[PDB]
């Protein structure tokens, strides 16, 4: 399928960043994963379009 | 040893909470773990004395 395949997640919990370049999100927000190595994934919000690093346990693939 | 044994952690990354009852902390802050089941652990900051739930990947046992 498309490039979104294995690369869409839903936030399980809200996240407020505390480090420049980290991305916040609301619970239930959908994000596109750009890079998924280590415990901080590069993502793009499908709500705001903004990009940055997210804590991987706060989201689930769907 | 003492009850602190297996129950002290150091924050690997800062955390800003976004849910009542969740506990924020600075990078390098030391916390006492009160409960360590699931991915949200009940903790007490050894900086502020405050208690609440923390995301377990943000800390490391020491
Ligand atoms: Ca998990
Ligand atoms: Ca970890
Ligand atoms: Zn960070
Ligand atoms: Zn919470």
From Swiss-Prot, chains A, B:
Cell compartments where the protein resides: Cell membrane; Cytoplasm, Cytosol
Phosphoserine: modified positions: 45
Coiled coil: none
Family, as annotated: Belongs to the protein kinase superfamily. Tyr protein kinase family. SRC subfamily.
Disease: A chromosomal aberration involving LCK is found in leukemias. Translocation t(1;7)(p34;q34) with TCRB.
Function: Non-receptor tyrosine-protein kinase that plays an essential role in the selection and maturation of developing T-cells in the thymus and in the function of mature T-cells. Plays a key role in T-cell antigen receptor (TCR)-linked signal transduction pathways. Constitutively associated with the cytoplasmic portions of the CD4 and CD8 surface receptors.
The name this protein goes by in its record: Tyrosine-protein kinase Lck
Protein species of origin: Homo sapiens
This protein's encoding gene: LCK
Included range, full protein: 59 to 119 of 509
């Amino acid at each position: 399928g498309s490039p979104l395949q294995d690369n869409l997640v839903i936030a399980l919990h809200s996240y407020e960043p505390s480090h420049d370049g980290d991305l916040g999100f609301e619970k239930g927000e959908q994000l596109r994963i750009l890079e998924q190595s280590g415990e901080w994934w590069k993502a793009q919000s499908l709500t705001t379009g903004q990009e940055g690093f997210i804590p991987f346990n706060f989201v689930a693939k769907a």
